[PDB]
Design a protein that fits this description.
Chains B, C: It comes from Homo sapiens (Human). Chains B, C: Belongs to the 14-3-3 family. The complex is a heterotetramer, with two copies of chain A and two copies of chain B. Chain A is largely without helices or strands. Chain A is about 0% helix and about 0% strand. In chain B, helix 1 (about 1-15) packs antiparallel against helix 2, helix 5 (about 115-135) runs antiparallel to helix 6 (about 135-160) and helix 5 (about 115-135) runs parallel beside helix 7. The longest helix of chain B is centred in the middle third of the chain and has 36 residues, at about 75-110. Chain B contains nine helices and no strands. Helices cover about 85% and strands about 0% of the residues of chain B. The chains are: A little secondary structure, B mainly alpha. The complex binds 2-[3,6-bis(dimethylamino)xanthen-9-yl]-5-methanoyl-benzoate (2 copies). One 2-[3,6-bis(dimethylamino)xanthen-9-yl]-5-methanoyl-benzoate (323) binds near residues 1 and 2 of chain A.
């Protein structure tokens, strides 16, 4: 499960 | 002319939410071997982000279903789940290879501003990172190394050519930090990069542009959100 | 077995939001020439609704852009907008013809319950109505007549076989009323049908099933919402 | 512009 945010 | 027509078609496809057609229109602009405008780079980036993002979302859903079935041991189901996951992994590879070929054959060689070079090396880092996300063994190590080399090239140009508030520079620092966290499993390096980019922007908030101040501010919140997630 | 496998694949595709694959899985179940289960009819209906619904949304967006450009008189843009609209109209025709062929060749002939016959004639009404929505002249009149004949067949079976609270019967009354409003341009007949279905359900609320009471209640609010919109 | 809701 993701625990990061990238450019979007 | 043909170029304005292709841009208009990209904008129609975007409104219609037909992102394959948006990709195809902007690929034709990229194939002209010219410096893209800000607007054109953004349309290209949105087109591929939507096309890859649908498969990344499907992959995480299918993978989540696979874990659940592994915990129930339903073996009939797992063969079907694994084969479906592998089909999505094939499409992720093809989409990443398509933009990566366009970057290498057209965009990077025709790029002649600091902004455009950072944008394109960053995008190359992003698409090798997407190849690495779902990969194992050798394939994961190869994607991770290509990703790392492109992010370093972008960072070298960004550090000399763009102010620390530039949204392309901040957006590079965000995605590179994510790379260190998710692909290289290094929360310490991820946190250092994200904190350094954030602090360097704070130190020179007088370099904020009228054109991009809200983009810069959003990206600075995303750097802070990762630090929140990672500490 | 093969049938349970195809249903599982449909459910995986649905979770993954890959609706083309969901259609392809449920088409194979429909091609077995057997009475579908409630669950199978629902998976088939959701698959086609998503696939057609993406093109119906694109068509309305493109059409809205066309009106705006007609009001500015941008003729270069209008040729591109019209050609793009026509491409989406081609895909709407192909999708509608695909489910309509499946209904005529497999589902309607194998249907052997009142519920299944109403469901399939209603779906035939819906897909001819979608053919009529964006059509002009002869093509619009032909789609409208095929739609009307299928909705009448569904209504005849629904009136004799299903209680007025049955969600398939209410969902038929909703879509048929929409047909009278949008395709035949008859607010009076649309309002009469929607009010009659609503009132008949109110009169026999003791026929509400434990299984579908919340489906029936939602559809009764949608009938009321159309009456709100149309009066 | 649409002024109707169908089954969805
Ligand atoms: C959420 O983002 C998350 C991260 C990692 C893992 C996870 C795996 C996911 C998918 C896999 N395949 C498609 C084969 C394998 C995974 O292996 C894992 C191994 C570990 N170890 C050994 C500590 C940890 C996590 C994963 C998941 C998950 O769904 O398992 C989720
Ligand atoms: C909203 O749902 C709405 C309904 C109808 C119309 C509208 C037309 C839409 C698209 C058309 N083509 C793709 C060619 C033609 C339309 O013709 C119309 C004609 C009338 N008249 C003559 C009273 C009224 C409406 C339409 C629209 C719209 O976008 O114009 C919107």
């Amino acid at each position: 499960r993701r625990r990061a945010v990238s450019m979007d | 002319d043909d170029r304005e027509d292709l841009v208009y078609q990209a904008k129609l496809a975007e409104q219609a939410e037909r992102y394959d057609e948006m990709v195809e229109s902007m690929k034709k602009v990229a194939g002209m071997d010219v410096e893209l405008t800000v607007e054109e780079r953004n349309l290209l980036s949105v087109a591929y982000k939507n096309v890859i993002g649908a498969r990344r979302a499907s992959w995480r859903i299918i993978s989540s279903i696979e874990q659940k079935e592994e915990n129930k041991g339903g073996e009939d189901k797992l063969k079907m789940i694994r084969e479906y996951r592998q089909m999505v992994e094939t499409e992720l590879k093809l989409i990443c290879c398509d933009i990566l070929d366009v970057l290498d054959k057209h965009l990077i060689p025709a790029a002649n501003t600091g902004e455009s070079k950072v944008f394109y090396y960053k995008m190359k880092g992003d698409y090798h990172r997407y190849l690495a996300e779902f990969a194992t063994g050798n394939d994961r190590k190869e994607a991770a190394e290509n990703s790392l080399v492109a992010y370093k090239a972008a960072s070298d140009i960004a550090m000399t050519e763009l102010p620390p508030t530039h949204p392309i520079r901040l957006g590079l620092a965000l995605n590179f930090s994510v790379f260190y966290y998710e692909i290289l499993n290094s929360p310490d390096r991820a946190c250092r990069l994200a904190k350094a980019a954030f602090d360097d922007a704070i130190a020179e908030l007088d370099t904020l542009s009228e054109e991009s101040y809200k983009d810069s501010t959003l990206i600075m919140q995303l750097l802070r959100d990762n630090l929140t997630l990672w500490t």
